[PDB]
Design a protein around this nucleic acid. Structure first.
Length: 89
DNA sequence: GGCGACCCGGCGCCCGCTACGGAGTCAACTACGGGTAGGGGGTATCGGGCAACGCGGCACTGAACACCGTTGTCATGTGCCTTG
């Protein structure tokens, strides 16, 4: 939807708003996924705590890795998101 | 419903200096791609060492004059002897 909106060719206004709405719903689902995986990322932050970096800082950096991973994740892989994410985390 | 205790946090300090011990720390991986950094190779540019000239002090050139200084020199003046 956002790809089609990004193109310069003219689209109908109602169709453009529908595409924007679908992209917004995708954004909402993205944040749903991130909040779901917050627990995994804090677990992996535990896994590297106590090495001179504050635990919440490690959590935040892992969260950066998490947003990267979701930005690079899709169902085309026949695996759960948990297995794929942990590498990027 | 402001007083009221009380409660609680929250804070704030807690004589002076010397002099007086040591120390030192548990949890991935690899692939790429660039960029720099070093290496030697070679090259234009700057710096240090010798030959030709110029001075400069003095030095010789004494040669040619000068400065006293000396014994050359002397035509011309005292002293004794002979004659008016």
């Amino acid at each position: 939807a956002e790809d089609k909106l990004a193109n310069s060719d003219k689209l109908a206004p109602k169709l453009k708003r529908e595409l924007e709405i679908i992209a917004e719903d995708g954004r909402r689902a993205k944040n749903h996924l991130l909040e779901a995986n917050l627990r995994l990322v804090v677990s992996l932050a535990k896994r590297y705590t106590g090495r001179g970096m504050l635990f919440l800082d490690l959590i935040q950096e892992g969260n950066l890795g998490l947003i990267r991973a979701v930005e690079k994740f899709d169902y085309t892989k026949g695996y759960k998101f948990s297995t794929y994410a942990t590498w990027w985390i």
